[PDB]
Structure formats: C-alpha cells, structure tokens
Design a binder for these strands. Structure first.
Lengths: 244, 244, 244, 244
RNA sequence: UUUUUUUUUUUUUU
RNA sequence: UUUUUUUUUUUUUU
C-alpha cells in the first residue's frame, strides 16, 4: 500500500557480496563451448554425426550460416540433403541458444577439419585464395576462416603469436567486409573491432590443448619446430599492418 | 454522398476549446511510475517479490533488458531461474505498456538498492569502475547506472546539483555508447541528447522524497551533511567538461 | 517444351498501345482520396462519425499515427476510448491499403477542422508554436500540420502561392526531423525531398474547391481579400529561404 | 564423452578431395533460369499464361516487384486482377526460391516482350524516357529495364558490345538510385557495383541464342546489319563516361 | 560485444 | 516516392 516505504525497506537490506556474486555467476554470459556442439552432433546424428559434420563444414564454408535461405538457390539433390540435415540436427540460422546447432558452430567446434577443407574449397569461399594472394603472396589457405583462431596456441612466444593473429586478421578484414555489407565503408580498426573478441575467445578457449594446437600449426606449415611463423605468415602479418 | 459538403460543414462548427483540452489530457502520454512497478511486483510475487527483485536487479545490471535473449547464452541453472521469473512476473523486453514489468523498470523503481549493488557488480557492468577510474579517479560506483538519477535531490543547491548530474553524465556518456552502437560515432552533446530527458524525469519525479533522496546520497558518500558533493564527484563533474 | 521458342513467339506479338495503356491505368498507383476516408468514417461510425473524427484529430495531432503503440502509455480512460475507436473504425498504423483508416488519413481528409484545432493544440504538437516563434515571430498556427496543404488554393498568384508553401515548409522541415530521426542529420533540401510530393499532392487534389480553400486561408488570416499572404507568412517564407 | 579426442580423431582423417568437391557442386548456388520461369507460367496458367504474362510485365515495369504492397494503392478493378494473378501463379515478392514466380522474374524471362513494352510505357517507369533524354538525346527506350541485358549478344565485336553495355548502364545508374534509396548518396562506381554482376549474368546466359539476340537488337534499331550500334547508343555510351 | 556478421551471382521496386 | 515519416518524456541493453 505504501510503495515509497516498500522501496525504502527493500533498499534498507544491505547487499550481501557473496549472495550477489553467486547470482552474477549463475546469470553470466555463457561463451561458445565446442564440447556442447559435438555432444548435440552425437545426440542427433549417432553413428552418422562425422559424415554429416563433413557436409555441414562444406555448407558453412561455401554457402554460409542460413540453412533455409541457401536452400532457395540450390539443386533438388542439395535441397533434399540440407532439408534432412535441418530436421535431424534441428539446425538454426544466426546466433541462437547454446542448446541449438548452427552450420557456423559445427565448423567452429571441428576447427582442425574445417581449416584442412579450406585448401580444397579456396576458390568457393566468400574471399578466395586468389584474392588473398593479390594482397599477400602464397597467403596461408588454412587461415581462411574465423574457426582458424581455435587452432592458435596462445602459449607461443608473443611476437610469433602476434604474427599468426595479424596474418589471420588480414583474411578476417576481407571476409567481414564481404559477408557484412555495413563494414565495407568502415576503417580497418572499426572492422577489427567486430572480429577481435570472437577471435581471442577461440584462441583462449580450453578446447584442444596448447601442444595439440601447435602440432596442427606445424603440420599445416604455419610454424616451424620452434613455433616461428613461415615467411608466408610474416608477409600476411606485414600486409595487415599496411592494410586499409 | 456529398463528401466536400460534409467536410465543409464539419470544419464550420466552432472549436470547443474545453472539449479539445479534455481530450488532450485523456490521451496524454503516461510517464514512468515506480508505484505501478512495485504494485505489479507485489501482485505477481507475493511474499517472494523482494527476493526475486534482488535477482532481477542483478539481471538488469549484468545482462540487460532482454530476458528471452539473455537466456540464450546462460547456464541451465540461470536459464531455469530466468524462465521462472519471466512466467511469474510476465517480464517483457524493451519499452512496452505500463501494465508490464521489465528488468529495467524493476531496477529503476528500486533505484536505492540498484545503486548499492553497483559497488559489488562494478566489474560486470557494460562500463566497469576500472574504465571509469581511467577517466576520473575513484569514480563514484553508486552513479554507474541510469537509475541513479532517481536518487538525486533536485532541491540541492544549484552548483551541488549540477556537480552530481555532470559526474553521473560522465558514466551515461560511456554507458549509452556501449549499449547503443549507433551513438559510438556521435559527439558528447549528441549522446547527451538521448539521456538528459529520462535522467531529468527521474531527478524531478515525485517517487521518494527530496529528504529521503538526500539521506541516500549522504549514506552512499556522494554528499556531506550540508549536501556538498565529495571530492570524487567534483573530479568527475570536471572530467565531464573535457570528455569527448 | 521449347522454352526459348515460347519466349520468342511471346515476343513476336507486337505491343498494342491501347491495350497496354488500358492496363497501366488499371494498375496505376491510387493517390489519397479524402472522399474514401469520409465514406469509411460514415460507414463504420454512422451518426457518431463527426464526434469520433474530432477525437481522432486530437489523437493524430498530439499522439501520432500508431494507435496500439500510443495506448501503451495512456490513462485507463484514454486506453478504453482508443480501443473502442480501433475496433469501430478498424484503425491501422502507418500507410496501409486505401480501404483502411488511419489517424493521419482522418486528419488529412478533414483538413479544415484539423488546422483550426492546431491553435488550441499548439503546445502539445511534436513541434510547438513557441518553438516555431523562435524561428519566425507569430508563426501561423494553422500551418502547423502536413494536412494544411489540403487548404492551399493552387490558383493563387505564383509569388503568393510560393510564400504560403515556403512558410508551411518551415514547419514541415522541423516536424519531419522530429518525427523521423534519420532526417535529423540531413540538409534542408534532403528533408524537403521527403515532404514536397505529399504536400503538392494535397495542394493539387480535387477535394475542396479553389474558392472554398481561399475562403479558409482568408478566415484563418493567412491571406487578405486579394490573396496576398500576411506579414507572418512572409516572415516564415523568408525564414525558410535562410533555414538550415 | 572425450570431446577433445573426438575432435582430434575427426581432424586426423585425410581430406577426400573427390568427396568434398562432389558436395560443393551439390550445394552450389543455383542461378536464374528463364526456362524454369516459363515452365511455371505454363503449369499455373495453361492456355492463359501469355495473356497473364503481358499483364505481369505491365505490373513489373510500372508498379514493381511487390504484388501485395502495390495492391494497397490500386483501383478495385486492378486489385481484383492482381489478386487473381497472385493466387493463380503463387506470386511472391523479392528474391525467393527458384520454385517461385515473381513479377521481376516474369519480365526477365520474357525480356524480348518487356523491352518492346518500354517504348509505350516510357513515361510510367521509375526513370522516364524524358529524364533519360535530358542526359543523352533520343536515349534508346528498349534499354530502359534491367531485363535488356538478356537481349545483349556477347559475341558482338568488343567495342560494339562495350557501347551497348555502357549506354544501358546510363539507365541502370538512374534506375538503381530511384528504386534503392541507400544508393542515392553513392558514386557511379558504387552503384555500378550493385548492377554489373546481374547484368553480366543476363548478357552471358544460355537463354536465347547469340543470333536471335542480335536479331532483337537489329529489330529494336539498336545495332545495324553488321552489329554496329546506332548514333543514339554511341551518344549514351559517351554520356555514361561523364555521368556522376 | 564475449566464435559473431553469411553479402553477391537477373538483384534492389523508392 | 505520389498526404508519407509519428521520435522524445526512466529510454537505448551492444
């Protein structure tokens, strides 16, 4: 009945630091977890999850993250395959609940495979290898997707780590402007402000150990035995420093 | 059938100023009323309204004003708590009917508790206390939310009142640009043009007396016994003058 | 079966100028017709249409063109009145089919009455009389709505006609920027490019004769017996030439 | 349960280039096919498809590509004709599935008839022939629609082909800015970047042979017996060079 | 904002 | 586009 008094009496109770912090942790933003993606893939796909994840990586890389929209301009065969994949994995577009699968999340969780596919798929990506070669010669094809950040060892020596991320950022700059048309008229620093947080989140995630991530970088020819980046990565990193 | 004659005859009847003014008052915009928020909280929550309002203040401050959207990136436990809060209090996003509760309205109506929570929640807010400290040292943590304006005594001496509002405006400038991305490229004066009207409406509302508001400012350490602002408030008020 | 041949055979038939022009006229854009608005008002409202149109003019002028949205911030009494008006007249928001009523269309069709209401409603409009007085002293209150263009005699001498339209355009410039926030950063010429076509359409409509429109302008004190605009209109027209 | 091991094992299997490429082809973007448009026209219309396609070309050229929206501002007769056309041909707006007809697709597939209609419809198009005449005298009326690109012979001698495309591009520049308001503040090169890919796709499509296309250009008076463009085409090609 | 943004390739329809 | 645009007034929640 006395609303002012009800508000004052409510304000009278002091803030319990322990209780309030327990609530902030409970309500906190839950970041991308590759384990949840693989769990959902296994749950919906069973023994077929790996073969279907290969198909979804090709869809994510060559057609994007909108399953129903990409179906509108597709062959009868492709349309039937994507329809079955949407029904089975309850595929959604964009950025929904973490209880949902997307083509981008499938590609991000299985980063090791995604980055290998990029060598073959190079000329069918939103920004082709040929386009990247015109900006920096022999541009590393394995860096040509945002999921590459999930293969980056954060324990690498500072300069070597910055060179890998700058090289990858040269792709991220071109890619973001092609798939996001409002970034086309913005500066390198403005476009970078949209991709650095999800890139760093992938670099610093606990999915795939530091050692296994460095083994991938070495196997793909991005770093040597001492973790020193290749001449192609150094070129791409310098091309990023110069880039508009 | 003779529409021109009907329009002429309609325009011929003299203007009844009493009738027109009665309709302007009847159709007038209905401003925010904290009493209605607390009434709805009591009606839906019963004996649980205060414990649930504490939870909703943590949600408003650390996750925002979109209950269904924040649930998409939350733990199973948090998701279950927010789901129950939405169902019980019929929580809506944005700016709906005044018959509806929102997390922002709960935080605004119980501004006294909201501002106390800010000391503990400082590093989980869209603009942290550490960021505010880099603009003005020992920035008042109690001013780091738009609901703080509801704790401002408009009867304070002019210079003391301007110092409190300028200090608080230093936060509102950073906060508005972080939560509203189209304001990021606009000047201090353009951003201020989006927060001054709701700020002044809270400062001049009839909810919580001038005396009780000044008791809160004194207890939060913002003003002394004479209503003179703290050195920290003065430093922020001055820092707002040279802020871009 | 032979799609190329089907396309060529279709292209072989020559375009019949008479037939094609009959189709362009049939499919042509149908402009605003005040007769259709009054007919719908009479059809839904019966003997109550005139009293309800007075209410809808007050709603259009002081709250805008979104019946369900304005109801969200309104008294129980006002909410009940607008709810009844929406159900009875099947009121829609924005720019729907010409078979539908809107608050803006009601105000536009009964321009004579709308412009008289503006003298009383001046301080409750999106751009007040006081605001207009600061740009041009004793700004004509009868010109303070887009529906005023429906009271303009196009047969007036050129200079007198341009002076009335320039004076009214000074309001249209302020009004368009207030109700349309994307026009706020645009030049006078860009803002004018959004209001000149609907303004000219109202000036050149066949609803209310040239003579009756000049009688309204004379009665409201906008032009003298010879159709020469008042000193206030000339000031407003010069203030428009200068305006940013 | 061991998600890191599952992701490592998945990334360990060698890339089957044959399998991946089979999936890129299956999932590849399906371009516009005029044969599919005519097939759907025949399937839904039967013996009435040609008479209805004439009506749909008038709608596409004078009212646009939004069937339900154009109906909102149309006569009772036109509204009834468009309602019947939407129901019969399951007409959609915008850019939907290739299994769907649109007014733009009907006009594009039967480009030969569309371009003939332009001579009669000139003053009812988004950019009129009179406006085009002010930029380049006696502007070719047959080029005043994007579907004209479907009548261009790519086997024409280089200079003659460039002259036809530059002349047509003078229209596409004006047209794109009128129907797309965000292009109004952009440069000639920025606007051209939105129309060159669909233009070139029509120029290089396999629908209607090179020889039949050149027969259309000759019959429309655009090129002589040797494929040399008319003086009017040359003047427009030259006017495109200095266009802003 | 915190692995997001998924654009073009007969579109954009003011 | 062709009587449209209906913003603020505890909002904007990235």
């Amino acid at each position: 009945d006395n609303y002012q008094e009800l508000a004052i009496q409510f304000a009278a109770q002091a803030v319990d630091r322990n209780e309030i912090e327990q609530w902030v942790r409970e309500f906190a933003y839950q970041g991308f977890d590759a384990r949840r993606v693989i769990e959902l893939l296994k749950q919906y796909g069973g023994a077929d999850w790996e073969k279907d994840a290969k198909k979804m990586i090709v869809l994510a890389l060559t057609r994007g993250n909108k399953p129903r929209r990409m179906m509108m301009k597709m062959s009868k065969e492709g349309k039937a395959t994507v329809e079955a994949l949407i029904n089975k994995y309850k595929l959604k577009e964009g950025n929904p609940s973490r209880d949902e699968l997307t083509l981008s999340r499938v590609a991000a969780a299985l980063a090791g495979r995604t980055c290998q596919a990029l060598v073959v798929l190079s000329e069918w990506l939103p920004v082709t290898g040929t386009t990247m070669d015109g900006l920096s010669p022999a541009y590393p094809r394995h860096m040509m997707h945002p999921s590459f950040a999930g293969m980056v060892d954060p324990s690498l020596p500072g300069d070597y780590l910055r060179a890998i991320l700058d090289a990858h950022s040269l792709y991220l700059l071109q890619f973001s402007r092609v798939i996001n048309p409002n970034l086309r008229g913005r500066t390198k620093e403005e476009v970078a402000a949209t991709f650095t947080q999800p890139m760093n989140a992938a670099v610093n995630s606990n999915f795939i150990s530091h050692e296994k991530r460095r083994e991938f970088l070495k196997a793909f020819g991005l770093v040597d035995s001492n973790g020193k980046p290749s001449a192609a990565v150094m070129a791409a990193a310098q091309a990023y420093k110069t880039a508009a």
